[PDB]
Design an enzyme around this catalytic site. Sequence first.
Site, short mmCIF file in Angstrom:
data_model
loop_
_atom_site.label_atom_id
_atom_site.label_comp_id
_atom_site.label_asym_id
_atom_site.label_seq_id
_atom_site.Cartn_x
_atom_site.Cartn_y
_atom_site.Cartn_z
N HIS A 19 1.80 4.43 -2.91
CA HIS A 19 1.96 5.88 -2.83
C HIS A 19 3.21 6.35 -3.57
O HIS A 19 3.20 7.39 -4.23
CB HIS A 19 2.03 6.33 -1.38
N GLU A 21 -5.25 7.72 -1.28
CA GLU A 21 -5.44 6.50 -0.53
C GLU A 21 -6.24 5.49 -1.34
O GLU A 21 -6.05 4.28 -1.22
CB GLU A 21 -6.13 6.79 0.81
N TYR A 34 -11.53 2.37 3.68
CA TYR A 34 -10.50 3.39 3.80
C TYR A 34 -10.11 3.96 2.44
O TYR A 34 -9.56 5.05 2.36
CB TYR A 34 -9.26 2.83 4.50
N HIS A 92 0.82 -1.21 0.00
CA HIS A 92 0.00 0.00 0.00
C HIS A 92 0.86 1.27 0.00
O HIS A 92 0.60 2.20 -0.77
CB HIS A 92 -0.94 0.01 1.21
N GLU A 93 1.86 1.31 0.87
CA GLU A 93 2.73 2.49 0.92
C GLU A 93 3.51 2.61 -0.38
O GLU A 93 3.70 3.71 -0.90
CB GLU A 93 3.68 2.43 2.12
C1 LIG Z 1 -1.32 -2.70 8.34
C2 LIG Z 1 -0.99 -1.29 7.94
C3 LIG Z 1 -1.84 -0.22 8.25
C4 LIG Z 1 -1.49 1.07 7.87
S1 LIG Z 1 -2.42 2.34 8.21
O1 LIG Z 1 -1.64 3.24 9.01
O2 LIG Z 1 -3.54 1.89 8.99
N1 LIG Z 1 -2.91 3.13 7.01
C5 LIG Z 1 -3.93 2.69 6.05
C6 LIG Z 1 -3.74 1.23 5.63
C7 LIG Z 1 -5.04 0.64 5.08
C8 LIG Z 1 -2.61 1.06 4.62
C9 LIG Z 1 -2.40 4.50 6.84
C10 LIG Z 1 -1.95 4.85 5.45
O3 LIG Z 1 -2.76 5.13 4.57
N2 LIG Z 1 -0.64 4.84 5.24
O4 LIG Z 1 -0.11 5.50 4.13
C11 LIG Z 1 -3.48 5.50 7.24
C12 LIG Z 1 -4.18 5.20 8.56
C13 LIG Z 1 -2.89 6.91 7.25
C14 LIG Z 1 -0.29 1.28 7.20
C15 LIG Z 1 0.56 0.22 6.90
C16 LIG Z 1 0.21 -1.07 7.28
F1 LIG Z 1 1.01 -2.12 7.00
ZN LIG Z 2 -1.91 5.53 2.56
#
Ligand SMILES: Cc1cc(S(=O)(=O)N(CC(C)C)[C@@H](C(=O)NO)C(C)C)ccc1F
Ligand SMILES: [Zn+2]
EC number: 3.4.24.83
Length: 486
Positions: free
Chosen positions: A400, A445, A438, A396-397
């Site tokens: 970004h 996001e 989310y 996910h990161e």
């Molecule tokens: C399990 C896990 C959870 C998060 S998170 O902090 O809950 N999250 C969202 C998440 C669905 C990906 C953060 C995020 O968007 N980061 O960029 C939001 C809360 C800003 C981030 C890394 C992970 F490995």
């Molecule tokens: Zn994010």
Amino acid sequence: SRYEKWEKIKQHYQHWSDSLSEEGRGLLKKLQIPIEPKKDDIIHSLSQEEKELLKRIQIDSSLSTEEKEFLKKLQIDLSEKEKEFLKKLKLDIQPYDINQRLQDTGGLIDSPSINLDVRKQYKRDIQNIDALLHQSIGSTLYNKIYLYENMNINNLTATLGADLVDSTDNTKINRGIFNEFKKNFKYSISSNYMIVDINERPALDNERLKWRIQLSPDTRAGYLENGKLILQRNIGLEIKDVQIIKQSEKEYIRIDAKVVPKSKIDTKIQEAQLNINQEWNKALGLPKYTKLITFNVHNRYASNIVESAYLILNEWKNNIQSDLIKKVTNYLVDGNGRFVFTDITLPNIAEQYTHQDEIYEQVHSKGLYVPESRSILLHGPSKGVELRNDSEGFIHEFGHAVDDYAGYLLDKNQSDLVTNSKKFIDIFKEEGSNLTSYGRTNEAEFFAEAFRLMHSTDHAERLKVQKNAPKTFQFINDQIKFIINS
Ligand SMILES: Cc1cc(S(=O)(=O)N(CC(C)C)[C@@H](C(=O)NO)C(C)C)ccc1F
Ligand SMILES: [Zn+2]
């Protein structure tokens, strides 16, 4: 005896105890019992407009469990105005908690993550406590006594804490999970002041971890009333044995640990950091001495943070095209970026706070991408939104970073994210609610979630994106090919 051992340790520190000023005693008490904020004082500070918002805010939509609970207690007495409001009120509801400040910062107490005046107050108290704890346990007592610490599983990592207690029978431990926990837990660090029991204490609610600790001859400590010791901060612990044990008809996790010099453990962490950079600089075609992976580790679950990084990066490599990985990572390196794996809170990570002067704009979460520093930040200990594991959150990161690089290639001067482009914005207002809860937060996001799910190990999750959000699906693949062909 339990009692004889207690009187013996008390005697060893008796002179030290009698020698304490009332100021020293008050300091030790403040360390044990954090000063909570008065709800009275908070609500009185709020204007009339403001007071009303709290009652209208749906609080559980964000903030941490403690903060959302405390605010609810105020309530009885999100729109862009609602987040900005909470981001500021959050700064006013924090207890003065010395041990928590040390843990959150991993001992780096100068980190600009809290008001300068309070930051200095913490620093003065910490320095004075260090000065109080000058008498070692000694060469006579250290190998004749054990000290104990009951601990909540969620304090090490809330991910395993969710399902480490057998869901079938809560009086027993999940064996398989336990074996994984045990196999990656070889060393531990305390950046704050451990408060340990001279005699083992019966477990209370959510205390399934029962530490048994042997001190070293020069471990500094101080006696606290009712059979406790406060230990100096900045010590290392070698994990000697992890076992499942039975106490009063229920199962617990015994952790045997020996105090060792912290520097010995930091040595192992830096060696591991060196190693993982060597392996991945090669696999990514990077210069051999590129600093990409950072182990920012200072707390009690230290070794697993290190081991977890290896698996996370492996999953990342197995599920994302090689060329995409190489292209995007090189871009991050071009901006001196990092993959930061840590057990201190993200506001205390330089790759974040260097670019965020306003504390109310600082974010703590499980994970983060910071464009200004081209860095991915992953916090081990905490729980994510909705997420199966840390591997997926990393992807996910990385989503970004993909967003970042794609928009950069679009316009190398005054670079932006593609999710700020008119095309994706409209795509977002259409398909923005078709994926994770989310994913609805914003364009960025939404992109990152879609990117993540498109690279899930589960087949079904990737077709869903192709199904429920085909425009988003195609758009991302377009960005991917565009990047690889650059
Ligand atoms: C399990 C896990 C959870 C998060 S998170 O902090 O809950 N999250 C969202 C998440 C669905 C990906 C953060 C995020 O968007 N980061 O960029 C939001 C809360 C800003 C981030 C890394 C992970 F490995
Ligand atoms: Zn994010």
